[PDB]
């Protein structure tokens, strides 16, 4: 009496493979305010 | 002064043996909307 849920794992494993894609696109934008955070500290201490 | 009613029990015991046959054919179709009723609830809560 089953219902075919084969279209579930095919849909959301491709879903969770897309959460990883837009996680790496944020990490690449948070290191901008990490690098610029501490080369401001070099100019101030000088 | 009897009338032979031997053809009665031979006719309706085979009749009530057929009500059981089409009762089990409905139960097999009501569990479809019982299973699908609560795997819809898993997808909604996720």
CB contact under 8 A, A1 and B35: yes
Question: Which residue does chain B place closest to A8, by CA atoms?
Answer: B43
DSSP A40: H
Contacts with A2 (C-beta within 8 Å, 6 or more apart), sequence order: B35
Question: Which residue does chain A place closest to B30, by CA atoms?
Answer: A1
- Please, which contacts does A7-15 make with residues 24 or more away whose CB atoms are closer than 8 Å? none
Whose CA is closest to B28, among A15, A36, A2? Answer: A2
The reply to whether A41 touches chain B by the CB within 8 Å rule is no
Whose CA is closest to B43, among A5, A14, A13? Answer: A5
What 3 state SS string does chain B have? Answer: CCCCCHHHHHHHHHHHHHHCHHHHHHHHHHCHHHHHHHCHHHHHHC
Measured distance CA(A1)–CA(A6) in Å, rounded: 15
Measured distance CA(B12)–CA(A14) in Å, rounded: 59
CB contact under 8 A, A1 and B39: no
CA within 13 Å, CB half, B10: 4
Q: Which residue has the tokens 């795997």?
A: B39
């Amino acid at each position: 009496g089953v219902i075919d849920t084969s279209a579930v794992e095919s849909a959301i494993t491709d879903g969770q493979g897309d959460m990883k894609a837009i996680g790496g696109y944020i990490v690449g934008a948070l290191v901008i305010l990490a690098v610029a955070g501490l080369i401001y500290s070099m100019l101030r201490k000088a």
